[PDB]
Design a protein around this ligand. Structure first.
Ligand SMILES: CCC/C=C/C=C/C/C=C/CCCCCCCCCC(=O)SCCNC(=O)CCNC(=O)[C@H](O)C(C)(C)COP(=O)(O)OP(=O)(O)OC[C@H]1O[C@@H](n2cnc3c(N)ncnc32)[C@H](O)[C@@H]1OP(=O)(O)O
Ligand SMILES: CCC(=O)SCCNC(=O)CCNC(=O)[C@H](O)C(C)(C)COP(=O)(O)OP(=O)(O)OC[C@H]1O[C@@H](n2cnc3c(N)ncnc32)[C@H](O)[C@@H]1OP(=O)(O)O
Ligand SMILES: *C(=O)CCCC[C@@H]1SC[C@@H]2NC(=O)N[C@@H]21
Lengths: 135, 69, 172, 344, 69, 271
């Protein structure tokens, strides 16, 4: 059956140890096993940071919210420290950036209800799995 | 080309060469402290160190020319 | 269970058991191999497996009656469920094996205080729920429509990865 | 402020030598007062010299300051007679050998390893009760370990060595395996111990009457009973010498082509059967003559002794032999002879 | 033992009854011949998948999909 | 295969001096880089390494060699280039190499020394999210034998990408110098103690010395292989010289892997 992930999180929980990295590895591995088996859709509805970005990247469709949502691996403070570049979190990881430049987003919704309408439209074309007959 | 260039923004903690020194390919030319790594930057070809444009302690920016060779 | 698996009937477990029955006659009767066959059949079956726990689910009873660890798909408990390695009276007797003067006045007091604490804190749904060994604790009236929703989800379940081979051996 | 690479390697070597005896002298003392060998010494005695590679020697129960390395089990891989095997061995010096979280995860990792490589697995079991400080974790991990037999049953040969009181939930994993070998007066296997039987049901029963090795062999829960651990190890080596490493591969071929002519030992068979139909005889006098040599390796001798189930070799290829034993109960097929033959 | 249409409130006259039923009968759209459709497994999706040589789905997906009738 | 005269005995019994040279290879200061070819050529037979695509994305080294005559694909972080950070180009290079090996049953060995992903806005705008996930997909899909040797750093998302255990690394071993953590201690202390660094800043204390003290305490507590070995994410912590023995054992045993992936026409790797 299709899997919808709604993603909104500051990456690994730093007080928990490497265990967070083990669970991230297992989540990615399951997205890879499911890749080409079931429709995987990722909604991004806040700042997804660090580990939270590769799971959407491995899913089939990524839907973002125009300026409420962001994705980035490395935060602005680290980019400033290493490279000197001042960048806002919106300019670094905004939905417009990932549409127009990175090519990672498939839709930029005007709001959360628009994002849900696009996810329902997407699902309306897809079968539930790679062997069921389509609607 | 005829430029050793800084591969990333970093702080010069060593310059391993003298103006007019002959250097072989793979020779160390500078050390830049960047990303918490004392990165070596090396001569990409046999040549002579000329126009050297670094000194110790300076922060230098990416793409800065370090020496001609 | 093996027959139902062969004819693809989904399996619903309705647990309420203290586990295997103790006794020398049951030991001599083969209870280890028979229980091992029950454990084998539950894991072998590929059909959708859904479990509802009512009241007691102790030890091997919890495990064998379609636990999540033995490949049950969805696990629900009524709020009366009691999931533990052993029931309160058995844990109390296992403690009273130490300083074992059961004629004493106070031991029969601390027994009941221990059983009260154990039935409040240990033999409950809540540790299994907070650890995720069971997927929901439900109001009892929800059960019929919950089972419909669950088995409709599981209608197409494919079990795997499994290595195809002549057969799986079982305790015999 | 930062230790050198030499200091870090020296710390590693000290930590590994500590992790070889996690209980320390306080638990070594009690083990050696009981005279039993350590969980690693058992593995080293079973496996080929120096072949053992240990996996998860530095595992610990997560977030617990009290935890000891290994979590109560030694797990890894090696060879027997140069052929790969997985092995695990309970270590009663750490938390009594009780099943913890990392105990479970280590043995599960080993079972998944042997299922992926396709090689036999030997489990040296001596104690694996619930961990008194966190028993519902032991409840979960008994089932998490039990499930992974799904990967092994009928794919790779499984062996259990019963070197202690296998009690409670500890019995339900061994009983899935293909061969149980128990050490007499040392290995025991039972669900509910004498004390709980006594105070729930009133009966009196000793450990031998309840679940001693000889009793469980006659009841057919144990496939072999031996007088020492070394005899158990050799019995495992012999047993594995008749088998492929997995469902797919071939067995070893041992001494093919011997004695291609009719021998005196063949001609002895013309008169081996007694003249009168009421007589009886030991079937082994036939079995020792009709196969390539006397290496008729019997399994479950004591269970249903009216039936012989054994490995033998024909032209060097192993075969399973099912034979009646007229010497016992006139060779009638009893309940246990039937289920023994079906299982074999 | 059939499930009949029911009118729960009021009584229509025979003319109103005829109009109600006539419009509902007209609304009874469909194939005009509902029967079990012709089976044609050519190029069914389950034949397109890659199965490992030992994959259990060769039993529980591929074979059952072909053999089910 | 080539037939090889494989020695007999334990790994520690069968060490060559060329193996013992690994025990002193890693510099004492974690800011000093080293050439990863010094490891690669010592674990491979005859030093013989066929490097693939050597001139591109030099922050990762990939190529073929043999271990006891069995071909292997090495993939290895290169501390001398961009401090070994993963970037777009190294990710695509390693993803294509790993998938080329897995097509042709060549097992892969990762030598891991990665501080994380390379910072920069141009990495985001060129799609490091989309294109780094290629190396995740390729490694998670690969069903040949996959062995991971961790040699100093393995941090954050790059720990997951460089063949973590739950990505299905069949054997993971770590040298004593390994450092496995969510992030560098400088950032971790700047997060987990941001409370106490407020209290100290309000008190006007030497917050710089307090950061240094907390960072030391964090580094000594958590930035080591042992927390991952305790979780069982590292199968063994080993003297560096054992590396060749552990690899050779793994690749001999995993010559056929009985592993499978759910039926599909093909996957949907990010492009
Ligand atoms: C296509 C192919 C497909 C095929 C696939 C199919 C395959 C799949 C198969 C799937 C298989 C599924 C597997 C599911 C597993 C079963 C579920 C497990 C859970 C349980 O079902 S249930 C756990 C176990 N657990 C209890 O029950 C506690 C209740 N218990 C009892 O039921 C018994 O009674 C007993 C015997 C167990 C307890 O035994 P004991 O009470 O432990 O023993 P004791 O007192 O004699 O001695 C020790 C104690 O005393 C102290 N002590 C005494 N003497 C000495 C001395 N000399 N020196 C030092 N200390 C000493 C010491 O401290 C210690 O303490 P502690 O008490 O151990 O903590
Ligand atoms: C794979 C490994 C990795 O990716 S390491 C990831 C490390 N990430 C960070 O350091 C994030 C720090 N900044 C952030 O808060 C987040 O990046 C973003 C997404 C920007 C959220 O910012 P904002 O909405 O302003 O939240 P905030 O800074 O006010 O923090 C609110 C509460 O969230 C918590 N939080 C956040 N991230 C983590 C984390 N990774 N681990 C643990 N806790 C985290 C903060 O501690 C804070 O808690 P509290 O509400 O102050 O009690
Ligand atoms: C050191 O002072 C902190 C900044 C450097 C952080 C390093 S850079 C390369 C890795 N990628 C990342 O996001 N953090 C790591």
């Amino acid at each position: 059956r299709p899997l919808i992930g709604i993603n909104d999180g500051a990456g690994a929980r730093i007080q928990e140890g490497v265990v967070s990295l083990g669970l991230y590895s297992r989540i990615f591995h399951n997205n890879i096993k499911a890749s080409g088996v079931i429709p995987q859709i990722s909604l991004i509805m806040g700042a997804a940071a660090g580990g939270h970005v590769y799971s959407p990247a491995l899913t089939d469709f990524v839907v973002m919210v125009d300026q409420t949502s962001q994705m980035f691996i490395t935060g602005p403070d680290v980019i400033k420290t290493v490279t000197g570049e001042d960048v806002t979190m919106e300019e670094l990881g905004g939905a417009h950036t990932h549409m127009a430049k990175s090519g990672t987003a498939h839709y930029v919704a005007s709001g959360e209800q628009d994002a849900f309408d696009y996810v329902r439209d997407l699902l309306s074309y897809l079968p539930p799995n790679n062997y069921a007959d389509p609607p | 080309g005829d430029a050793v260039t800084a591969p990333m923004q970093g702080t010069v903690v060593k310059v391993a060469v003298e103006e007019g020194q002959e250097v072989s390919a793979g020779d160390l030319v500078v050390v830049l402290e960047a990303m918490k790594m004392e990165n070596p930057v090396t001569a990409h070809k046999d040549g002579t160190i000329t126009g050297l444009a670094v000194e110790a302690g300076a922060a230098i920016t990416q793409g800065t020319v370090i020496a001609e060779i | 269970i093996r027959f139902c698996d062969s004819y693809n009937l989904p399996l619903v477990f309705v647990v309420d058991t203290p586990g295997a029955m103790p006794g020398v006659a049951e030991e001599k009767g083969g209870i280890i191999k028979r229980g091992g066959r029950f454990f084998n059949a539950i894991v072998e079956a590929d059909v959708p497996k859904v479990t509802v726990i009512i009241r007691k689910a102790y030890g091997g009873g919890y495990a064998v009656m379609g636990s999540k660890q033995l490949s049950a798909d969805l696990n629900f408990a009524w709020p009366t469920a009691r999931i533990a390695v052993i029931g309160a009276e058995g844990a109390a007797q296992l403690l009273v094996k130490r300083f074992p003067d059961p004629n004493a006045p106070e031991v029969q007091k601390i027994r009941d205080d221990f059983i009260e604490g154990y039935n409040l804190n240990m033999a409950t749904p809540w540790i299994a729920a907070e650890r995720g060994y069971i997927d929901a604790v439900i109001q009892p009236h929800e059960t019929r429509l919950l089972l419909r929703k669950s088995l409709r989800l599981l209608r197409d379940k494919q079990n795997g990865p499994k290595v195809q081979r002549k057969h799986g051996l079982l305790p015999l | 402020t930062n230790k050198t690479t030499a200091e870090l390697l020296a710390e590693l070597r000290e930590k590994l030598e500590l992790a070889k005896e996690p209980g320390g002298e306080k638990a070594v003392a009690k083990r050696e007062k009981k005279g039993i060998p350590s969980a690693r010494a058992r593995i080293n005695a079973l496996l080929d010299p120096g072949s053992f590679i240990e996996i998860g020697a530095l595992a610990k129960t997560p977030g617990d300051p009290n935890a000891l390395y290994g979590d109560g089990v030694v797990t890894g891989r090696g060879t027997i007679d140069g052929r790969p095997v997985g092995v695990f061995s309970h270590d009663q010096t750490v938390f009594q050998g009780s099943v913890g979280e990392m105990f479970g995860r280590k043995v599960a990792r080993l079972m998944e390893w042997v299922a992926m490589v396709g090689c036999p697995i030997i489990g040296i079991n001596d104690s694996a009760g619930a961990r008194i400080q966190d028993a519902v974790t032991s409840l979960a991990w008994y089932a998490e370990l039990g499930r992974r037999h799904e990967m092994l049953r009928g794919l790779v040969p499984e062996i259990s060595l019963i070197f202690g009181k296998c009690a409670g939930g500890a019995v339900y994993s061994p009983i899935q395996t293909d061969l149980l070998v128990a050490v007499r007066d040392q290995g025991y296997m039972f669900i509910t111990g004498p004390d709980v039987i006594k105070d729930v049901t009133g009966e009196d029963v000793t450990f031998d009457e309840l679940g001693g090795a000889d009793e469980q062999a006659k009841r057919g829960n144990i496939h072999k009973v031996v007088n020492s651990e070394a005899e158990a190890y050799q019995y495992v080596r012999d047993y594995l010498s008749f088998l492929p490493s997995n469902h797919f591969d071939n067995p070893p071929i041992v001494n093919p082509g011997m004695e291609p002519e009719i021998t005196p030992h063949d001609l002895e068979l013309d008169s081996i059967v007694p003249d009168a139909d009421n007589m009886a005889y030991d079937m082994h006098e036939i079995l020792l003559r009709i196969f390539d040599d006397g290496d008729v390796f019997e399994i479950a001798e004591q269970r249903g002794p009216a039936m012989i189930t054994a490995f033998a070799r024909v032209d060097g290829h192993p075969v399973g032999v099912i034979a009646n034993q007229p010497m016992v109960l006139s060779g009638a097929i009893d309940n246990e002879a039937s289920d023994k033959a079906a299982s074999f | 033992h059939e499930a009949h249409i029911k009118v729960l409130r009021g009584e229509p006259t025979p003319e109103e009854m005829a109009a109600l039923m006539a419009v509902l009968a007209s609304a009874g759209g469909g194939p005009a011949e509902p029967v079990k459709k012709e089976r044609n497994m050519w190029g069914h999706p389950v034949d397109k998948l890659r199965y490992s040589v030992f994959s259990w789905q060769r039993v529980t997906l591929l074979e059952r999909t072909h053999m089910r009738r | 295969l080539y037939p090889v005269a494989i020695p007999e005995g334990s790994i520690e019994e069968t060490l060559t001096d060329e193996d013992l040279e690994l025990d002193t290879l890693i510099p004492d200061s974690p800011n000093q880089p080293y050439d990863m070819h010094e490891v690669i050529t010592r674990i491979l037979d005859d030093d013989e390494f066929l490097e693939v695509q050597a001139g591109y994305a030099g922050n990762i080294v990939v190529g073929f060699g043999r271990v006891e005559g069995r071909p292997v694909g090495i993939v290895a972080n290169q501390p001398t280039q961009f401090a070994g950070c993963l970037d777009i180009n190294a990710s695509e290079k390693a993803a294509r190499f790993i998938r080329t090996c897995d097509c042709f049953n060549i097992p892969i060995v990762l030598l891991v020394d990665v501080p994380g992903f390379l910072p920069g806005t141009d990495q985001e705008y060129n799609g490091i999210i989309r294109r780094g996930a290629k190396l995740l997909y390729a490694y998670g899909e690969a069903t040949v034998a996959k062995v991971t040797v961790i040699t100093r750093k393995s941090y954050g998302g790059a720990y997951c990408v460089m063949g973590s255990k739950d990505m299905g690394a069949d054997v993971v071993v770590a040298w004593p110098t390994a450092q496995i953590a969510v992030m560098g201690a400088s950032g971790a202390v700047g997060f987990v103690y941001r409370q106490q660094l407020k209290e100290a800043a309000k008190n006007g204390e030497d917050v710089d010395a307090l950061r240094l003290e907390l960072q030391q305490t964090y580094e000594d507590t958590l930035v080591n292989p042992y927390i991952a070995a305790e979780r069982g994410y590292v199968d063994a912590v080993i003297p560096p010289s054992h590396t060749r023995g552990y690899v050779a054992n793994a690749l001999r045993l995993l010559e056929r892997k009985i592993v499978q992936m759910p039926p599909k026409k093909h996957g949907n790797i990010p492009l």
